[PDB]
Structure formats: structure tokens, C-alpha cells
Amino acid sequence: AEYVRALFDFNGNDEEDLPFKKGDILRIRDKPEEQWWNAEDSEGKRGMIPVPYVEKYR
Amino acid sequence: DNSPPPALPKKRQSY
């Protein structure tokens, strides 16, 4: 129910991060801190993403 | 003439 869209590629630094490509659509799964959220990609992969790299999607 | 990737925000916690 909450999706965002990537504004920039993100490649992670840690294994726990979720890489993505500019324009990718992600589902938010948890918001443990303000700037880093847990998300799921179209493939079902999960990991942390940086909030400033995304925008609300639809 | 595009903007660069933003500075990655620091993580408050470990995941």
C-alpha cells in the first residue's frame, strides 16, 4: 500500500541495503528511522533504502 | 547537465 519511485540509482554499501535503479518502484515495508526504510523491489527482494533517493509513487 | 546523486544520509542505526 505505500510505494515510492527511485529518483537516482542506489547501489548500497552494506549487504543489508537494497540496491535499485533510477525509476524503479519499491514497496515500503518498515520505517525504523527517518532516512532509511526497509523496502521490497519488484523481484521480492528486501533491504534498506535511503529516503532522499525516492519520491512517493501514485 | 544533470544533478548528482545525493549525499547518502547517515544511518542512525545498524540493520
Pair A25, A42: CB distance under 8 Å: yes
Q: What are phi and psi of A49, to 5 degrees?
A: -130, 155
Q: Is B15–A52 a contact, with Cβ atoms under 8 angstroms apart?
A: no
- DSSP category for residue B13: S
DSSP sequence for chain A: --EEEESS-B--SSTTB--B-TT-EEEEEE-SSSSEEEEE-TTS-EEEEEGGGEEE--
Establish, for the pair of chains A and B, how many residue pairs have beta carbons separated by less than 8 Å.
33
Q: Measure the CA–CA gap between A42 and A45, rounded to whole angstroms.
A: 7
| Domains by residue range for chain A, with CATH | 1-58 (2.30.30.40)
Q: Measure the CA–CA gap between B1 and A57, rounded to whole angstroms.
A: 25
Cα–chain-centroid distance for residue B14? 15
Residue with cell 542505526: B13
Q: Is B13–A33 a contact, with Cβ atoms under 8 angstroms apart?
A: yes
- DSSP category for residue B14: -
Pair B9, A50: CB distance under 8 Å: yes
C-alpha cell belonging to residue B14: 545498524
Instruction: Give me the residue from A13, A34, A53 closest to B6, CB to CB.
Output: A53
